[PDB]
Design a protein around this motif. Structure first.
Motif, mmCIF file in Angstrom:
data_model
loop_
_atom_site.group_PDB
_atom_site.id
_atom_site.type_symbol
_atom_site.label_atom_id
_atom_site.label_comp_id
_atom_site.label_asym_id
_atom_site.label_seq_id
_atom_site.Cartn_x
_atom_site.Cartn_y
_atom_site.Cartn_z
ATOM 1 N N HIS A 7 -3.864 28.960 13.664
ATOM 2 C CA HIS A 7 -4.009 30.276 13.048
ATOM 3 C C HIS A 7 -2.868 30.410 12.046
ATOM 4 O O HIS A 7 -1.781 30.892 12.371
ATOM 5 N N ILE A 8 -3.109 29.939 10.822
ATOM 6 C CA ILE A 8 -2.121 30.115 9.764
ATOM 7 C C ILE A 8 -1.988 31.597 9.441
ATOM 8 O O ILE A 8 -2.768 32.436 9.905
ATOM 9 N N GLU A 9 -0.957 31.918 8.657
ATOM 10 C CA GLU A 9 -0.510 33.283 8.398
ATOM 11 C C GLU A 9 -1.645 34.239 8.056
ATOM 12 O O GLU A 9 -2.274 34.118 7.002
ATOM 13 N N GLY A 10 -1.893 35.193 8.947
ATOM 14 C CA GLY A 10 -2.883 36.231 8.746
ATOM 15 C C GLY A 10 -4.268 35.777 8.332
ATOM 16 O O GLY A 10 -4.721 36.136 7.243
#
Lengths: 50, 49
Positions: B19-22
């Protein structure tokens, strides 16, 4: 994002609450003093430098 | 009973993705499996005298 709060060492909800409080106090000052400042004072009220 | 009944049960399915940034996380899935069926017969013998 949760990542920004968790990974950023210096960021915290405390500084956000501080910003909220500062802007809130400034808003109160503006609300309760801008009617005095922005009013179009008639010649009856106004007094010259003299 | 004359013939038994299959067992039933539900199961959830999910996989942990990076889960990369947002970003938006992809949901899982539920599925069910059922057991088999068994049955019982009758037997008998006798004598006359």
């Amino acid at each position: 994002t949760k990542e920004m709060k968790d990974f950023n060492q210096t960021f915290s909800v405390e500084i956000l609450n501080k910003s909220i409080g500062e802007s809130y106090n400034a808003l109160l000052n503006h609300i309760h003093l801008s009617p005095i400042i922005n009013f179009n004072y008639k010649a009856s009220n106004k007094t010259a430098f003299k | 009973p004359q013939v038994m009944d299959a067992k039933w049960a539900l199961q959830g399915n999910c996989v942990f993705l990076e889960h990369i940034e947002g970003e938006e996380i992809k949901f899982g899935t539920i599925n069910a499996e059922n057991g088999p069926v068994a049955r019982i017969q009758t037997y008998a013998t006798g004598f006359e005298y």
